[PDB]
Design a protein around this nucleic acid. Structure first.
Length: 135
RNA sequence: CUGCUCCUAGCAUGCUACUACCGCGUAGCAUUUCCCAU
């Protein structure tokens, strides 16, 4: 037969490939979530300036811009922590930011999956925890 | 197929300790022999 696509299982790099794929999904969901928010009701200048710079470096600049990459990576480390196994991950994220939709959220993941993987991830499968005593 | 762990066996290496003998080196103690022509 002929395999249309999708990762195999008997190879030696499925785990690392899936990890990289997961990181990419999370990062693109964060980028999508930030850029779909009105800039007229944003908090302290910093984030609004960052969003403006992001749109410019995304659709107007042609080549790469390293410093903005470092800054955005540091921002993600500041307000988004991920622990990644092969297609399995746990996220610790600041909640007041997510209240205003300035970082990821489950609805963003649903939308990203719907338009980028052709699958509808029902939200009843996810879990969200507010406490940190229990793990 | 990757990663983690247990257990077993063997090997090999390193290191430590013990025992024996050896000789060395040092020190102490003590003795045994005592010499001759062309």
């Amino acid at each position: 037969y002929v395999k249309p696509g999708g990762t195999s299982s008997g190879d030696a790099t499925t785990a690392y490939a899936n990890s990289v794929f997961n990181i990419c999904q999370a990062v693109t969901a964060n980028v999508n979530a930030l850029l779909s928010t009105d800039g007229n009701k944003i908090a302290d200048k910093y984030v609004r300036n960052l969003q403006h710079r992001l749109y410019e470096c995304l659709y107007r600049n042609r080549d790469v811009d390293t410093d903005f990459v470092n800054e955005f990576y540091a921002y993600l480390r500041k307000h988004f922590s991920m622990m990644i196994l092969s297609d399995d991950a746990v996220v610790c994220f600041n909640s007041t930011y997510a209240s205003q939709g300035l970082v990821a959220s489950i609805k963003n993941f649903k939308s990203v999956l719907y338009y980028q993987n052709n699958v509808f991830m029902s939200e009843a499968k996810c879990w969200t925890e507010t406490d940190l005593t229990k793990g």
